[PDB]
Amino acid sequence: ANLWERFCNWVTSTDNRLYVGWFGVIMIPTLLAATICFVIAFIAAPPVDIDGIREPVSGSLLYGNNIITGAVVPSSNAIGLHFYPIWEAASLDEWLYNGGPYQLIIFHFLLGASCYMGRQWELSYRLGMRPWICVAYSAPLASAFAVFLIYPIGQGSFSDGMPLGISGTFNFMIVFQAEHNILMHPFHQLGVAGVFGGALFCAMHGSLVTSSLIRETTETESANYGYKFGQEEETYNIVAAHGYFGRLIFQYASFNNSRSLHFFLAAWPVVGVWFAALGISTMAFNLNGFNFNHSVIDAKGNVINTWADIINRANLGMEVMHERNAHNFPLDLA
Template structure:
C-alpha cells in the first residue's frame, strides 16, 4: 500500500516476482514520516502490508554504515594511518543517506524512498529524473564526477605508492611509520 489507498504493491517472491523484480517496498503513504515499529501495528500482517520492513531495514542499514565509518576511522587511527579511507567512504554513505532518508523527509513520507531491489531502484531513478531532472543539476554532475573521479585517483595513487615503497621500518611496524611529516628524503622510489 505504497500510496495509502489500500492498493498493495507486491514486492516479494511469493507474489510472483522474480529476483529482478522482487523488492522491499517503502512504507505506506498513510504512515507518512511516522516511525512504524512492529509493536505499533495491530498485527504482523498489517505491519507487512504497510511496508514496516522497509523502515526496519533502511534505518538499521544507515546505523550500521555509520558505525562502519567510525570503525574505519578507528582502525586508521590505531594503525597510524591517515583517515582518508573514512573520508572517501563518506561520499557513498552521503548518497545512500540522501535517497533513503533525506529525500523522503523532504517529500514528507517514507513512501517516496528508494525501494530495495533491482527494478525498484531503476524505477526510482526514472521517476526521480522525470520529476526533478536531477541529471542536469550542476551539483549532481559535480558530485558524480567527484565520487567516480575520487575513486579512480585513489586507486591510481594507492597502486603507484604501494608498488614503489622503500621499507624504512621493521617487519613488525607499519610501513606508514617510515614517513615523518616534513622529511626531506623520499620513502618511495621515483625512478
C-alpha cells in the first residue's frame, strides 16, 4: 500500500478507539476550534455590543458573570448577516467588541455537528448496521440550526441568534414569545408533546423492562449483575411486561412486538422535535403562533377577554421592555 492508501485505511479503520472517518476529518478540527474558542471566550472575553447600539453586554466569567449569567454573546446588529471572520477586523480588540467569537464558534460548531451526523451514518456502514441513528440525531441538529442559523437569516442578523449561555438562552426564549407567540404555535406544541412524551415513554419503557427482569441474582447484590454483556438470551420477560401494561390500560394499547415498541420510542420524540425545529425555522419568517386577541366580543361589541388576551398582556410586557434603547420607530419589524 502507498501512503494515501494507508492513510485511507487508518481514517476509515473500524479499530480506532474513536472512529475518525471522512466526516470526522472535517468534524475533528471544526469542533476543536469551536470548543477552544468557546472556552476561552466564556472565561475571558470582554463585553460585546450585541445590539449594535454601543451598549456592550458582558458575557465572560472574568468580567463579572457566573456560570448561570455567562455567555458568549451574539455578534453585533451592525454586522447583521455579514460574515465577520477574524481577518475582517482591524484588530482582535475590534473583533472582540463586535462579537466575532460568536460567529467563529457557531459556524465551526454547525459544520462539526453536521459532520457528527454524517459520521454516525459512516460508522454504521463500516459495522454492517442499519443506517438511521443519524436520522434520529437530525432532530436536535435541526434544532441547533434553527436557533443559530435559520432564525438569524429570517430576521436579518446573527445578533438575534440564541446566545451561547444559560441566561442568554432564556432571553432568546422570552423575546421569541413576545415576537412570535410561540406558545400558541402548533409546531411548538407538537415539540412539547415530543419532549414530555419522550420523557413519559422513556420512564415507561425503563420501568416496564426493569419490572420484568428475570431473577438471576440474590438480594445482597445489584440485579444488574444478572445481565452479562453480549449474552444471547433476553434479560427480561416481554410477555410479562406486555401482560402487565396491557392490563394497566387494555390489551391492544400495549406493544407485544419489541421492534414496533422501539420504533415508536425513536419516532415519537424525533418527529415532535422535528416539528419544534420547524416551528423556530418558520417563525424565522414571521409566520407566528395563533392570534386570538379580541376574538370574543359581546352583543354590543365589548371585548370579552379569554386566556389568549392575558397571554397577550404578558407578551406586551416582554415586547415593550426588550432591548430598551434599540428601537426608534413604533413597530418592531425584525
